[PDB]
Amino acid sequence: LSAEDKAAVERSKMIDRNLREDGEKAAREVKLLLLGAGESGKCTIVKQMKITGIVETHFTFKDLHFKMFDVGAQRSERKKWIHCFEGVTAIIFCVALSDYDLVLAEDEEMNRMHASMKLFDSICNNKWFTDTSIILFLNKKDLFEEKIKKSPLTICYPEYAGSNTYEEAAAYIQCQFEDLNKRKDTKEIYTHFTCSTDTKNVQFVFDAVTDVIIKNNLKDCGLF
Amino acid sequence: NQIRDARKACADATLSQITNNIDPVGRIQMRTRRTLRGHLAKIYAMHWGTDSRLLVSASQDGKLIIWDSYTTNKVHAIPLRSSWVMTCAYAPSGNYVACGGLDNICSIYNLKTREGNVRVSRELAGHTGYLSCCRFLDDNQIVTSSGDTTCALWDIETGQQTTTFTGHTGDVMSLSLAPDTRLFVSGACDASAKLWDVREGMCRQTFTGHESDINAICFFPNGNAFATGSDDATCRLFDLRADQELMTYSHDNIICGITSVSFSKSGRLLLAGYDDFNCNVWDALKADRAGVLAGHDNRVSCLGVTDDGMAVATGSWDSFLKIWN
Amino acid sequence: QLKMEANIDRIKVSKAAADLMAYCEAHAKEDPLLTPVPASENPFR
Amino acid sequence: DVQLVESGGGLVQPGGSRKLSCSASGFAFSSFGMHWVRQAPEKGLEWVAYISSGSGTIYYADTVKGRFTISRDDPKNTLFLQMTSLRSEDTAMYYCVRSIYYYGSSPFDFWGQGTTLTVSSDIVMTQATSSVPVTPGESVSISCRSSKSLLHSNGNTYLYWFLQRPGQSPQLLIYRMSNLASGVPDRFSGSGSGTAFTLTISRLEAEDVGVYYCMQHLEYPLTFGAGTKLE
Amino acid sequence: CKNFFWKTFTSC
Amino acid sequence: MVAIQCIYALVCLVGLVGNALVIFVILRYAKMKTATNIYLLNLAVADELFMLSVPFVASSAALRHWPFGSVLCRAVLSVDGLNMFTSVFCLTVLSVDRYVAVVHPLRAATYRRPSVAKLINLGVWLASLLVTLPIAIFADTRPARGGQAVACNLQWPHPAWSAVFVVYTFLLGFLLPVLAIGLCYLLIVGKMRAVALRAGWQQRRRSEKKITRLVLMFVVVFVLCWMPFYVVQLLNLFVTSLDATVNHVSLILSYANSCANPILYGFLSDNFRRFF
Structure with missing residues (x-):
């Protein structure tokens, strides 16, 4: 420490001050993992969020910053990078209600909704996402209503016997997705219907992430 | 069928049956000198230098911080545009430092500049899958692997990829150059270790001894051998001069897979990091775990040893990196 | 295109094993990890 | 555009101040x-x-302690120099060095153009020579002496060499007495054992002449050499 | 009287 | 007689086997991670300092005399009173920390750094010195005049000044701290219930039910252990028919919750769950 290391430890304290400040603005903002079930996931929620590789959108709403991360369709396996998003505030898993009677452009080995139920369950069994909450969003509201009038609704689930009404079908498919995860006490699943109003979809998101950051703060103090 | 049919008849004895007469290495006691604090996110990769003093570490908070190990004084703080960085490398001289984020862009940063900030030297956005590892041949050419089951040899002055190594079936997850930076071996998720060349253009021999996803890889300072770290809780040190497997280091005491493989100066202590919150030190000659490196709260991810074998750096997901000696 | 890179340098595996053992035993003296180093010689106090 | 500009009056009367203002450009x-x-x-x-980065460490010299008040405005990228009372001893050409201190750095890198001013314990850096008349073209040796051995416990000796071309500001030639600066040819070679501090200019082109200086970076206030002019 | 206080007996 | 002395060794041993592990849980795994770990560490050391000063007053009531020194009792009687104050004061700054971190997340970031957490703990210890100094400058050793025996207790020149101090420690020591932790915890459950219904959960979930029950238990125990202790002090000024038959167990109620609060917070937390 001769006129050089004294300034070196002072520069390190200035860097540590910026790093400490960088963690504060990064903790108050909201992080969102947008992992879809099909080829193009989250086609509606990203239209209102004001902006190769992943796509992240930074926008402020209701005096709160949000960061929605979308991976799109990548040929890499999710098992090698699913642990990188551990610690995210919320997870948005957009699923379309038109996947039970439709088959993607593939080998047709499994149904679209059957692959969506397995993909949603694959995220919950991961040992990294046992604490983060997944927010479910149902797409194609009115499109699913017209399909009910010309479909038995029991393609993927033959053991189901219920009413052919959008009010009952949306409630049954909500409980079916809530019974896929084995960790029901650690994870809280939020289910909502995507609307074209362009302001109600993010309002539920703001209310959902508020219920999560209030639990992390309660977990911080220890009351959780 | 006939590829390795004759490679078994020429193996009458193994490496473990020969090294049982030399002086066995006792228990290695390594004490944590200083813990490199200051981070606020999980560390994933690091790199050492020739001076054995400076080292770079990648963190998920969007900061590629560089400091010296002897005094633990943060020198530069590089704000990263892609916070989800999974790999980083350090130059042998200390001029350029690159990092592979999730945006599939190997943002190269120049340290020695006329200004104070660390500007971007070049951006490599030719890959389609996630950038998994990157290694500096020199300050102009760089070999960067990705999650697109391929490797690429990029040039900083040119800006485009010179040669794209497309010979792997599984997802590439590791890279390891040679002491002369002439050849290099890469281990992918298909349990395949291919020795890729520069003069020939791409691989010249492969190794499929493992049984699961290979996470990390290293290179022996001799240049004729190298160890590989898979996910089935075993490491198989293959041979480049006999296209076979010298020996294996497996044990039922451990259940987690390997995440980091490193070698010392003499190559005796095989530094192998695991997912059991600790790191192991293998003899690499007789398959005997001498000592264990414990003290990390979360599972370690990166592990590098200096070129002179002075210090050993272990980084975990608790935003704390420890320096061993 | 498997036979493009196949090599014949596999007549003996024990001889190459001796090359790895001879290298680690000739450079074990210059390794601070193997050789017990004092606090005055090594860095980090 | 890394050059620095200084502002100063022509001459000031005793009892006032000029408030020397320096601005920065280009570099961060x-x-x-x-x-x-x-x-x-x-x-x-x-x-x-x-002054350090962020007004953290403020150091004054033994000759100006109690009279000069160094100030700065980092959001403006401007450096000030407040003074209490001017004396005939302060008549000099003030410069700004724009240095930085870290491992592997090049301290005292690019001095400023400097402004003029006219008014109407410490390591004594001594030099064995003051003016060496020698023909240019090949090796010419220059040494420097110090009061205290600059060899620190870590193993780094902090010494910096300046050239100061006639009519310009001093520039860094070799930092740490052994590492060549950023922007200098491979002709400068520095050796020494704690106090020897020999500098061999193996090329010595025409533009290498000037008043040289050797400054220590171990004790405050920092003291420069006597000056070695080459012809 | 009082005959007691915080933690001991006090004179009245 | 000795039956009340029998549970005295139990209350100290309960706080001994528990508080010795609370520090071992914090500085081994968390090691002062943020501001929330400094307060629980402060309550853990404040209980032990209160558990090492209680054996002097526990056995002295049985012998009806003070065998220790005259000047040494003036400090010990002020240390345990300060340990009583620094414990209830730390419970106040803990409730404010839990209130700011939950209700105002944007304002709590200024207090999440260890820089403010260290000075706010040194400050709350200094606030205990200001409250207990009137009980220290007046503390002395004077005979009780009953049997000409030695006794160490607060001395006042006039009985009128005795009524000022008995309520001063009731206002500043009991009513104000329990009103802070009572209001800070009420604003936490009130804000949590309002946010839970906005997300679509009209009924209280399993996580919300556990928190409001863990919060409700912290306040009622702080009342049923300190209010019976504080109510006995004021009734001694009007009628002296107590015959010291309740003063021995009323202090034991203060020795219980002060020695159980670090364990009630430590054992019912995520740090001790991973260690056990």
């Missing part, structure tokens, strides 16, 4: 820490003041 500010070094006519360099 708030990360180096500006210096203050004045040069009296037909004299040697002498450190005045130094």
